[PDB]
Structures are given as structure tokens and as C-alpha cells.
Design a protein around this ligand. Structure first.
Ligand SMILES: *[C@@H]1O[C@H](CO)[C@@H](O)[C@H](O)[C@H]1NC(C)=O
Ligand SMILES: *[C@@H]1O[C@H](CO)[C@@H](O)[C@H](O)[C@H]1NC(C)=O
Lengths: 53, 54
């Protein structure tokens, strides 16, 4: 699909019936509508680890 | 000592023995390069100066 479709609020259904199990099995999947941003720090290697060479 | 035998190197030691010295004996030394030289040739190198020191 397009990513606005999964971002929209519209649900998506996987409908499978089996021979032995005649009933359709509905999997209705959506993203949980209803927030912070990460602060990526990058930490450099230790001095001890470099003295191992 | 003859001047050819000093301009080679040739460490000389002076040992003295006396009844107030520690092990009763002490000694000094000199050669051409230690004592009163006309040339001081230091060559020091420091290395890993950052290190991880505790
Ligand atoms: C003086 O120091 C430099 C630098 O290490 C060395 O290359 C040179 O040979 C030295 N000269 C004498 C006379 O010691
Ligand atoms: C001074 O020391 C350096 C390093 O050991 C040596 O290469 C140089 O020849 C020395 N100078 C003399 C005059 O021996």
C-alpha cells in the first residue's frame, strides 16, 4: 500500500476460511491511534579498550 | 692516567674506607662523559601521555 493508508486510521482485514474450519477468521489490524522524540547521543570508545590494541 | 686513556671513556672509581661510613666503604666514579662535560645530550620521550591512570 501507500504509507498514508496505514497512517490514516483505516483498518486492514485478513480474511481466511478453512475447509475443516468453515468460519472466516477476521484479523482486523490498525496502528494504535492514541509522543516524544529521541536524543541520540554517540559515546566514543573507552581508553581502556584501545590500550588493549 | 695518560690522555689517550681518558679520551676513550674509561670509568675510574675512587673507593675509600673509614670507620664512620655505612658499610665501612664508599666509592665514587668518573669518566670522560659524566664529569664536567662540554656537551649535555638529553633525549627524552614521553609517550601515551593521555593513558588511563588510576
Ligand atoms: C644534539 O641533539 C640532537 C637532537 O636529538 C642530536 O641529533 C644531536 O646529535 C645532538 N648533538 C650533540 C653534540 O649531542
Ligand atoms: C647525542 O645523542 C644522540 C642520541 O643518542 C646521538 O645520536 C648523537 O650522536 C649524540 N651526539 C654525539 C656527539 O654523540
Amino acid at each position: 500500500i501507500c504509507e498514508d493508508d496505514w497512517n490514516s486510521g483505516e483498518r486492514f482485514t485478513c480474511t481466511v476460511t478453512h475447509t475443516d474450519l468453515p468460519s472466516p477468521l477476521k484479523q482486523t489490524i490498525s496502528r494504535p491511534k492514541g509522543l516524544h522524540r529521541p536524543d541520540v547521543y554517540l559515546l566514543p570508545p573507552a581508553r581502556e579498550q584501545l590500550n588493549l590494541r | 692516567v695518560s690522555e689517550e686513556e681518558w679520551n676513550t671513556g674509561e670509568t675510574y672509581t675512587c673507593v675509600v674506607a673509614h670507620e664512620a661510613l655505612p658499610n665501612r666503604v664508599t666509592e665514587r666514579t668518573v669518566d670522560k662523559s659524566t664529569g664536567k662535560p662540554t656537551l649535555y645530550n638529553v633525549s627524552l620521550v614521553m609517550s601515551d601521555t593521555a593513558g588511563t591512570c588510576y
